[PDB]
Amino acid sequence: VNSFSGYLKLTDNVYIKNADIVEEAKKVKPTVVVNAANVYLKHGGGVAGALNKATNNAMQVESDDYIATNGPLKVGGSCVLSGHNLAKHCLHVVGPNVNKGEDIQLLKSAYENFNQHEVLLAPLLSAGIFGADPIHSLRVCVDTVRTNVYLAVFDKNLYDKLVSSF
Numbered sequence: 001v002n003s004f005s006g007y008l009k010l011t012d013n014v015y016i017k018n019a020d021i022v023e024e025a026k027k028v029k030p031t032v033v034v035n036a037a038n039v040y041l042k043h044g045g046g047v048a049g050a051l052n053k054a055t056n057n058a059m060q061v062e063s064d065d066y067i068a069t070n071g072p073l074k075v076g077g078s079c080v081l082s083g084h085n086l087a088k089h090c091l092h093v094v095g096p097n098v099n100k101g102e103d104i105q106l107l108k109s110a111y112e113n114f115n116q117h118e119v120l121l122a123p124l125l126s127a128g129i130f131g132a133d134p135i136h137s138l139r140v141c142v143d144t145v146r147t148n149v150y151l152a153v154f155d156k157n158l159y160d161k162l163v164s165s166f
């Protein structure tokens with residue numbers, strides 16, 4: 001049992017809250033936190049930059065060792081690394097970046113990675129700096145993920161739009 005509080009129930013297994021995922025991870029210390037990664041695990045900005053800064057750059061040092069050994073991930077793929085001070089594990093998931101011309105169909109493959117874990121704290125994949133429509137990202141999440149997902153949405157106006165239009 002992870003100590004999530006204040007989430008709104010959208011479906012049987014999807015919950016949502018207006019919160020920064022970094023602050024939710026620091027407080028809850030969940031079994032799994034999802035990072036919105038790129039294929040190189042270069043955590044510069046957005047959710048990845050913010051989670052990495054909260055680990056004092058330990059997530060980036062571990063990630064560079066992983067890439068030196070294994071090479072890059074695929075768009076739609078994932079890897080499990082340490083959660084450091086934020087969680088037991090971090091599931092690094094690569095959603096398509098539409099600003100780079102990546103195929104939005106890969107968003108469903110990205111969310112399929114969540115089904116390997118019973119419960120996760122996660123952001124909306126491919127939203128924010130990745131350029132995709134967040135309303136579409138929540139619909140793909142609800143229609144793909146079967147395990148328990150707790151979505152932390154940073155922007156209040158987007159949170160209100162997501163709930164109202166669901």
Ligand SMILES: O=C(O)C[C@H](NC(=O)c1ccc(NC(=O)NC2CC2)cc1)c1cccc(C(F)F)c1
Binds near residue numbers: 046050127155
């Ligand atoms: O969560 C959402 O609302 C979707 C998306 N989120 C991010 O891009 C996102 C980026 C960073 C962080 N966390 C921090 O930066 N933490 C601070 C302490 C360093 C969290 C989430 C977003 C946010 C703002 C505006 C828009 C708009 F384009 F629609 C989308």
